[PDB]
Amino acid sequence: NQIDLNVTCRYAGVFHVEKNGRYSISRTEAADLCQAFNSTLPTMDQMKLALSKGFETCRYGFIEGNVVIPRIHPNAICAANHTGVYILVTSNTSHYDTYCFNASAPPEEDCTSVTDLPNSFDGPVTITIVNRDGTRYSKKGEYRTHQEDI
Numbered sequence: 001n002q003i004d005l006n007v008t009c010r011y012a013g014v015f016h017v018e019k020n021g022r023y024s025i026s027r028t029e030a031a032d033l034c035q036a037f038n039s040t041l042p043t044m045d046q047m048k049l050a051l052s053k054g055f056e057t058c059r060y061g062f063i064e065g066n067v068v069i070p071r072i073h074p075n076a077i078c079a080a081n082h083t084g085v086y087i088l089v090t091s092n093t094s095h096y097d098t099y100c101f102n103a104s105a106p107p108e109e110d111c112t113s114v115t116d117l118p119n120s121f122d123g124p125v126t127i128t129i130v131n132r133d134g135t136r137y138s139k140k141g142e143y144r145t146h147q148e149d150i
């Protein structure tokens, strides 16, 4: 009973979370997941500022109201070569990664590793935070409040 959460640097408090190395988070799960990091789904404004500080990914993830990819460099296989916060317009499917926003994080680039999941609750899952540098933090708990996300 294990969940891997790959996380990134924070940029103006915004970061990306990928669950189990696949697009596998629902919108409800994403809000609960960010809540476990004492975080919220970023607003479009928060994501734009994060982008201006150096944030980009090549993965669709939830923000408040939309599913986006922040892009700095145009890459043909990431957000169809677009730059800026690319908004997913048409998709059949509902599961993506998520972005999260931690208001207490540093204002610009914070590429230190994540060493806690401070607001997860009691549960049976071994949740492992996997940083880009491989370092890991694991704890037994749960963050999913909606049964259909479990």
Ligand SMILES: COc1ccc(CN2CCOCC2)cc1OC
Residues within 6 Å of the ligand: 121, 122, 123, 124, 142
């Ligand atoms: C040992 O099994 C479990 C332990 C804890 C939980 C999570 N809680 C969270 C609060 O509400 C009740 C369940 C689930 C479990 O089995 C699916």
